[PDB]
Amino acid sequence: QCVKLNDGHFMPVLGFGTYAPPEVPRSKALEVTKLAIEAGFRHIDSAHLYNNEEQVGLAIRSKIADGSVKREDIFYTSKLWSTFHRPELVRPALENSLKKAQLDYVDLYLIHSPMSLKPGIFDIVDLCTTWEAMEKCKDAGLAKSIGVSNFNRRQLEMILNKPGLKYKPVCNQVECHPYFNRSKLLDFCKSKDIVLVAYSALGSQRDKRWVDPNSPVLLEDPVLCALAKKHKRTPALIALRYQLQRGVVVLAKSYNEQRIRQNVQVFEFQLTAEDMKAIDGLDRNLHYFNSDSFASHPNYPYSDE
Ligand SMILES: NC(=O)c1ccc[n+]([C@@H]2O[C@H](COP(=O)([O-])OP(=O)(O)OC[C@H]3O[C@@H](n4cnc5c(N)ncnc54)[C@H](OP(=O)(O)O)[C@@H]3O)[C@@H](O)[C@H]2O)c1
Ligand SMILES: O=C(O)[C@@H]1CCCN(S(=O)(=O)c2ccc3ccccc3c2)C1
């Protein structure tokens, strides 16, 4: 189960999310990534931010070297950090991510966020010049596909309307779940053959640096719980399955053996139209990442409602 991107490459519709907070040792990323691939995840999501590209690359290479998968059955993503928006900085950051991971190429490179930062407080950078630079990475074969993350609709339109555009973004990876379902943005992405990829699809890690602990816990929601009991699955599985039936590619982070295996069960059952409607009724503009440290950035994405 893959979707065709708008540049003719294929992305598997379920991905493994690799971020863990700095309190978790680096070494854990190697082990869970292996477990992920072993349970059947073929889409692995990382970034320069995560400080785990070496372990995620090792895990991938190890599962190739033990014969379980070829390179080409793995879809590996990484992301350009926000200090590296000036265009001359883009290929070197990708080359850097490739060497940490000890791979020849990434299946996908994303701009991690539109909120540019001084290299190395906010920066002002024409993100069309960043994008041109992402295109040259694809033309060089350093990334199979290129995309954006944390763009709102108007920020997407800016790239799509660029003079001399060579490659549209293949996807926009944004926060997306039953409390913040992004359906207007999803409709716009669909009208342009851009894949929406959902992060914090299970309600996020609730890290105190960015998430108010008073916020409702997505996986305690009573409608997801009732649906879980109706289907004899789990609330995580319902949140995951909702995204696939809306045409959304979904990430799922877990560092626990049993949850990793449970999550691939999303392929084994269906929700009804009435189920999908009950879930669409939970939407309440709740973006779990909600911090003073970005909220007044000039290109804050949630300034467009
Ligand atoms: N582009 C961006 O700016 C951005 C932002 C956020 C995240 N991401 C990407 O998205 C990935 C996923 O999002 P996320 O990190 O926010 O976490 P998430 O996918 O919402 O997961 C939330 C928590 O759910 C738990 N979980 C997973 N499966 C479960 C299950 N079956 N039952 C109950 N708990 C379960 C995990 O805890 P356990 O580990 O204990 O199982 C995890 O800490 C990230 O790791 C990263 O790759 C990108
Ligand atoms: O990609 C991930 O998993 C990271 C998790 C923790 C930090 N973030 S991040 O790039 O600093 C970040 C922080 C705050 C944000 C607020 C609104 C939207 C995106 C954000 C990304 C991404």
DSSP conformation letters of 269-288: ----HHHHHHHHTT-----S
DSSP for 156-180, written as a single string = HHHHHT-TT-----SEEEEE-BTTB
Q: Is the CB of 90 under 6 A from ligand 1?
A: no
State which of 75, 151, 225, 253 you would mutate to test the pocket of ligand 1, scoring each by most atoms of that ligand within 8 A of its C-beta.
253
| Rounded-to-integer distance, Cα 296 and Cα 270, Å | 41
Q: Which ligand is nearest to the CA of 198?
A: 1
Resolution attained, angstroms: 2.2
Quick one: which atom of ligand 2 is closest to the CA of 199?
A: 3
| Rounded-to-integer distance, Cα 104 and Cα 229, Å | 45
Nearest C-alpha to atom 41 of ligand 1 is from which residue? Answer: 254
Beta strands 10-12 and 2-4, pairing class: antiparallel
How many whole angstroms from 91 Cα to the centroid of ligand 1? 28
By residue count, the chain amounts to 305
Amino acid at 150: N
Cis amide prior to 120 (ω within 30 degrees): yes
| Rounded-to-integer distance, Cα 281 and Cα 224, Å | 11
Instruction: Give how far the C-alpha of residue 34 lies from the chain's centroid of Cα atoms, to the nearest Å.
Output: 19
How many whole angstroms from 302 Cα to the centroid of ligand 1? 21
Q: Which CATH class is domain 1-305?
A: alpha beta
Q: How far are the Cα atoms of 44, 80, 197, 205, 261 from residue 17, in angstroms, in the given order?
A: 6, 16, 12, 11, 14
User: Tokens 């059952």 appear where?
Assistant: 269
User: Residue 11 contacts by C-beta under 8 Å, 6 or more apart in sequence?
Assistant: 2, 3, 5, 43, 75, 107, 108, 145, 170, 171, 195, 249
SS3 label, residue 38:
helix
| Rounded-to-integer distance, Cα 150 and Cα 148, Å | 7
Q: What are the residue boundaries of the structural domains of the chain, listed by start?
A: 1-305
Structural contact between residues 275 and 225, judged by C-beta atoms closer than 8 angstroms: no
Structural contact between residues 83 and 118, judged by C-beta atoms closer than 8 angstroms: yes
Nearest to 156 by CA among 122, 179, 190: 190
3-state helix, strand, coil in the chain (%, to 5): 45, 15, 40
Question: In the 8-state DSSP scheme, what is residue 16?
Answer: E
Instruction: Give how far the C-alpha of residue 111 lies from the chain's centroid of Cα atoms, to the nearest Å.
Output: 11
Nearest to 109 by CA among 154, 78, 149: 78
Please, which experimental method was used? X-ray
